[PDB]
Swiss-Prot record, chain A:
Glycans are attached at residues 55, 62. The gene is GRIN2B. Belongs to the glutamate-gated ion channel (TC 1.A.10.1) family. NR2B/GRIN2B subfamily. This is Glutamate receptor ionotropic, NMDA 2B. The chain holds residues 287 to 384 of 1484 of the full protein. Heterotetramer. Forms heterotetrameric channels composed of two GluN1/zeta subunits (GRIN1), and two identical GluN2/epsilon subunits (GRIN2A, GRIN2B, GRIN2C or GRIN2D) or GluN3 subunits (GRIN3A or GRIN3B) (in vitro). Can also form heterotetrameric channels that contain at least two GluN1 subunits and at least two different GluN2 subunits (or a combination of one GluN2 and one GluN3 subunits) (in vitro). In vivo, the subunit composition may depend on the expression levels of the different subunits. Found in a complex with GRIN1 and GRIN3B. Found in a complex with GRIN1, GRIN3A and PPP2CB.
UniProtKB/Swiss-Prot annotation, chain D:
Heterotetramer; the NMDAR subunits are modular and harbor tiered domains that function in concert to regulate opening and closing of the cation-selective ion channel pore. Forms heterotetrameric channels composed of two GluN1/zeta subunits (GRIN1), and two identical GluN2/epsilon subunits (GRIN2A, GRIN2B, GRIN2C or GRIN2D) or GluN3 subunits (GRIN3A or GRIN3B) (in vitro). Can also form heterotetrameric channels that contain at least two GluN1 subunits and at least two different GluN2 subunits (or a combination of one GluN2 and one GluN3 subunits) (in vitro). It comes from Homo sapiens. It is linked to Neurodevelopmental disorder with or without hyperkinetic movements and seizures, autosomal dominant: An autosomal dominant neurodevelopmental disorder characterized by severe intellectual disability and developmental delay, absent speech, muscular hypotonia, dyskinesia, and hyperkinetic movements. Cortical blindness, cerebral atrophy, and seizures are present in some patients. This is Glutamate receptor ionotropic, NMDA 1. Component of N-methyl-D-aspartate (NMDA) receptors (NMDARs) that function as heterotetrameric, ligand-gated cation channels with high calcium permeability and voltage-dependent block by Mg(2+). NMDARs participate in synaptic plasticity for learning and memory formation by contributing to the long-term potentiation (LTP). Channel activation requires binding of the neurotransmitter L-glutamate to the GluN2 subunit, glycine or D-serine binding to the GluN1 subunit, plus membrane depolarization to eliminate channel inhibition by Mg(2+). The chain holds residues 266 to 314 of 938 of the full protein. The lineage of its organism: Eukaryota, Metazoa, Chordata, Craniata, Vertebrata.
């Protein structure tokens, strides 16, 4: 899982979350994004965006997020250190399987 | 009319990402991509903060993803600080962005990648059963967020 | 909001050893005490409220 | 009602007096051990700890 693989998925996460926002609400106000003289406030429904950023999915792959801010469906890889210092794959864990 | 730029810090070189991303931007969806690749060779927080704040102050950007290759365990909270006060989404993929966080702000739509602290113990317990290691003891330090680990074990 | 970058440049650059942060004149706000501790955290600089 | 209040809660003029005094003791005792590394100067050049 390399840098180009994760970068492309990352933008797809936000874009597909914006699609249904433009489908139902379609009234994004583009709040003033400026730390200098931050006169903007949370008058609009920016908080409602939290609900639609949780069940984000793409390419048929469940890329949902947890409340804490974790994807909660990761792909852990188990590695081992040999007699000489070198990391090598041992096994994979997915969906509570080994 | 919303674009999602990407910020990258480190020695890693990646130029053609924008070209691939533009062709792989899912043109069937109304995304209006405005991806910009910005690179710089320092990890100073405030210097990075100035660049981030100025990033969408000049142009119109409403989303950013931070990529890095470093062991500095302080950059993740900075995005939380920015995302809390500035109502813009922030997503973490690699490096300091993707690491365990104690707790976020009450109103902070920040998200990261990587396994949770709770999920680490569960997978670790499912490898100490096929190899029959039923006798074990635990030693850990005062690193923040360690309390739930022993609590997860006992549950 | 801009104090985060306004603290280190104006104060930390002076080769300081600790930071003394005052109380906001408002009766109760997190606007003041929050950024004044984030800046020192990167360098583990002590801060005293 | 049986309320509660704390003494000397808003006279920060004496409070800053204690704060500068107590840290003054720390620095005097600080300058008795080797490996006194200079804290970072400048908010751009240095990014380490």
């Amino acid at each position: 899982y390399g840098l180009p693989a994760r970068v492309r998925d990352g933008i797809a996460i936000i874009t597909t979350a914006a699609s249904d926002m433009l489908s139902e609400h379609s009234f994004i106000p583009e709040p003033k994004s400026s730390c200098y003289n931050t006169h903007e406030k949370r008058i609009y429904q920016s908080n409602m965006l939290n609900r639609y950023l949780i069940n984000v999915t793409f390419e048929g792959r469940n890329l949902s997020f947890s409340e804490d801010g974790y994807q909660m469906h990761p792909k852990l890889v188990i590695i081992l250190l040999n007699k000489e210092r070198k990391w090598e794959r041992v096994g994979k864990w997915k969906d509570k399987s080994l | 009319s919303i674009g999602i730029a990407v910020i990258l810090v480190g020695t890693s070189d990646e130029v053609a990402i924008k070209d691939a991303h533009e062709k792989d931007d899912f043109h069937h969806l109304s995304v209006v991509p405005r991806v910009e690749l910005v690179a710089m060779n320092e990890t100073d927080p405030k210097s990075i903060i100035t660049r981030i704040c100025d990033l969408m102050s000049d142009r119109k950007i409403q989303g950013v993803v931070f990529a890095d290759d470093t062991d500095q365990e302080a950059i993740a909270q900075i995005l939380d600080f920015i995302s809390a006060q500035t109502l813009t989404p922030i997503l973490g993929i690699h490096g300091g962005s993707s690491m365990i966080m104690a707790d976020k702000d009450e109103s902070s739509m920040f998200f990261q990648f990587g396994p949770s602290i709770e999920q680490q113990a569960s997978v670790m317990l499912n490898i100490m059963e096929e190899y029959d290691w039923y006798i074990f003891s635990i030693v850990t330090t005062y690193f923040p967020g360690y309390q739930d680990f022993v609590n997860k074990i006992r549950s | 909001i801009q104090m985060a970058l306004s603290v280190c440049e104006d104060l930390i650059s002076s080769q300081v050893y600790a930071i003394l942060v005052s109380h906001p004149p408002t009766p109760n706000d997190h606007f003041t005490p929050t950024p004044v501790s984030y800046t020192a955290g990167f360098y583990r600089i002590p801060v005293l409220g | 009602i049986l309320g509660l209040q704390l003494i000397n809660g808003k006279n920060e003029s004496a409070h800053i007096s204690d704060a500068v005094g107590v840290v003054a003791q720390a620095v005097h005792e600080l300058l008795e051990k080797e490996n006194i590394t200079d804290p970072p100067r400048g908010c751009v050049g240095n990014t380490n700890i």
